[PDB]
Amino acid sequence: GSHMTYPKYLLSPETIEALRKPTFDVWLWEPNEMLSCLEHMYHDLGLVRDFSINPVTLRRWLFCVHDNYRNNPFHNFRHCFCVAQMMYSMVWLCSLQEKFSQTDILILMTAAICHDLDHPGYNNTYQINARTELAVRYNDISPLENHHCAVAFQILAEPECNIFSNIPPDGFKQIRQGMITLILATDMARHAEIMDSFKEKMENFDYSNEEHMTLLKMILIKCCDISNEVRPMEVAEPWVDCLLEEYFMQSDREKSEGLPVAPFMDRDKVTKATAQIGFIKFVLIPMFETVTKLFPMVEEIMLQPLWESRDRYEELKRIDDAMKELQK
Amino acid sequence: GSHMTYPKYLLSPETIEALRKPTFDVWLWEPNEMLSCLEHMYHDLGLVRDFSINPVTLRRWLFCVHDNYRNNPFHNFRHCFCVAQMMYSMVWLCSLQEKFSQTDILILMTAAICHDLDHPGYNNTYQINARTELAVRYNDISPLENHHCAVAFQILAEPECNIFSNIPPDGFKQIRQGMITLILATDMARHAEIMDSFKEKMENFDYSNEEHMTLLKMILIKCCDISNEVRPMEVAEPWVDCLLEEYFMQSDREKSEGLPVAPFMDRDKVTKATAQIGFIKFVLIPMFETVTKLFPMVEEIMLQPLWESRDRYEELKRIDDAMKELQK
Numbered sequence A, B: 001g002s003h004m005t006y007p008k009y010l011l012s013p014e015t016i017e018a019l020r021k022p023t024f025d026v027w028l029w030e031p032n033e034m035l036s037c038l039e040h041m042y043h044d045l046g047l048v049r050d051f052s053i054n055p056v057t058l059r060r061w062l063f064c065v066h067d068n069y070r071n072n073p074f075h076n077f078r079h080c081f082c083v084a085q086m087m088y089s090m091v092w093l094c095s096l097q098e099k100f101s102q103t104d105i106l107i108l109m110t111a112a113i114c115h116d117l118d119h120p121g122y123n124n125t126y127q128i129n130a131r132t133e134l135a136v137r138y139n140d141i142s143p144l145e146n147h148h149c150a151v152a153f154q155i156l157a158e159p160e161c162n163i164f165s166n167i168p169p170d171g172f173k174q175i176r177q178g179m180i181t182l183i184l185a186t187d188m189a190r191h192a193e194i195m196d197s198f199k200e201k202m203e204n205f206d207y208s209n210e211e212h213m214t215l216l217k218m219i220l221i222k223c224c225d226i227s228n229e230v231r232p233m234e235v236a237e238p239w240v241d242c243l244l245e246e247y248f249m250q251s252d253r254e255k256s257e258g259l260p261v262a263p264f265m266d267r268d269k270v271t272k273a274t275a276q277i278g279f280i281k282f283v284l285i286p287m288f289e290t291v292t293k294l295f296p297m298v299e300e301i302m303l304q305p306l307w308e309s310r311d312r313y314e315e316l317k318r319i320d321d322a323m324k325e326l327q328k
């Protein structure tokens, strides 16, 4: 719509607008454009303003983050961007600036961006069963998430990437603790525990109770992390195939090294349709249902697409099933 | 008593019987003799037998463990020997072989031996405040105990040191999980918490309830860890100066680096007597009282010597107070 053309890293006005919504097509963008988006979120949320973040430091920091994401089929830099972009979406959708401090929004955003740093593309169960250096390092306790987190603060300790350098020590310590809690909370082995605690608080929720608020931020980051299916189908569906790529890599290796294979990583047991129907019905919908009690607009903008997804996979399944009826 | 003289590393019959009581003078022995003592405990408790431990591997493992203790004034290989030797004493005293599986005995001993591996001589609070590599690696969560536990399994993963090599993977997993839980339980930041969970199980204890037993093993290790004052006074007391040496090393360093100093480590605020009075009264005694409810022989063997220590130290402090009052 502009009188001249601009480089891609100069986000257009339409892109800036689109970036606030969960319909943003995360696939359209190169790393450099994604980096620009993230940068813009920090400015637009008032976090550069309120935390006195050096604007060049913010950029050096994001570039460093990018460099410490690996090129995995799924647990890559585009995935962290989805998680961040969904968090951003949720701030707008759920009017989170009315409810949360700027420090809380900083924690949410920074944890979202950092939460899968240097992921190897094999999960905690692989680490633990194979007795990897990481499992040994972290005593079989959320080995990956502990590493993501440590890498995060390693990056922030480099003075040219330290977006928190103009924050007082107490604020730093507060932000550090919140980020650790949040990144640790993304270990899916703790999903039911965290949901139970949340739901328990939801018996009588209190926005001025720090404990309630901590659980609400753990639930937000968990929402954002596993939210691909909330997105328009054409955006959502490619992510399942990337995840299965990663998972098949792992179960191949596990077979070959004599380690236990998860059925949901077994090429002969999983299908995309059946895996997603299960995850949608039994993990995603129920989680977003609880959140919808606090944020009613979540039903229309995030539950609806999930219902639509579930239904469409049910259709796909009827067809995978017929295909298998031709194959023995 | 014998017809010829044997090398020190061949323990005499008398040392062997004496090794089973809390009364054993840990100060008399060289490292090689302490190593022979630990080796003997594994054979004597039936652990070599019941877990098919290669007797040479057991010694390589012990020697390696010894090497990875640092030459700290307190948190050294002799301390490790104390903690293990007290555990072994408690085995006999409390007839723990009636109550616990051999796997649990193994866990208890191996955790006692390993629980302070590669201690730097500066506590978790220093690590955290100074933002050390350990603190950043472990996300400020029990960084030292995490580290001790990691180093234990780094050692065991060296095949010449793997005393668990003839154990099937299910048993290994169970031993590892147990040792991790017990080593992490030695973080004194968690003391009141663990004591409280213990106490609530103790309301109706159940030796066949795995959670009850886990807590019990946690307390047992915690008992052995801080048990110096249960020992005869001449054995117990030189440990206090060793610990203060380490603490003063820390407060001096904090002072120099402009970091917070804990009053209990400050050479200006600390008295030996006042240090010990409170610790004995409010940490050691209450902890051993709850154990005595399950193991009533503990009163005479471990409480009585704590009562004496408390009395001795309350007397020293009067003499301190009469000196201070007498002067200023």
Ligand SMILES: CC(C)n1ncc2c(=O)[nH]c([C@@H]3CN(Cc4ccccc4)C[C@H]3C)nc21
Pocket (backbone or CB within 6 Å): A188, A225, A226, A227, A228, A229, A240, A243, A244, A264, A275, A276, A278, A279, A282, A283
């Ligand atoms: C990384 C995992 C937790 N993840 N993140 C997003 C999604 C997704 O859309 N689908 C799946 C599938 C669900 N997995 C089976 C499963 C069912 C219920 C609870 C936990 C896992 C297998 C994935 C292909 N995993 C995701």
Ligand SMILES: CC(C)n1ncc2c(=O)[nH]c([C@@H]3CN(Cc4ccccc4)C[C@H]3C)nc21
Pocket (backbone or CB within 6 Å): B188, B225, B226, B227, B228, B229, B240, B243, B244, B264, B275, B276, B279, B283
């Ligand atoms: C290393 C600590 C926990 N420890 N281990 C044995 C002993 C001991 O005999 N005395 C003390 C005293 C406790 N004091 C500080 C403190 C009190 C309460 C909680 C944690 C530390 C000073 C020590 C001389 N600490 C020991």
Ligand SMILES: [Mg+2]
Pocket (backbone or CB within 6 Å): A115, A116, A186, A187
């Ligand atoms: Mg993750």
Ligand SMILES: [Mg+2]
Pocket (backbone or CB within 6 Å): B115, B116, B186, B187
């Ligand atoms: Mg320790």
Ligand SMILES: [Zn+2]
Pocket (backbone or CB within 6 Å): A083, A115, A116, A186, A225
């Ligand atoms: Zn993730």
Ligand SMILES: [Zn+2]
Pocket (backbone or CB within 6 Å): B079, B083, B115, B116, B186, B225
């Ligand atoms: Zn210790």
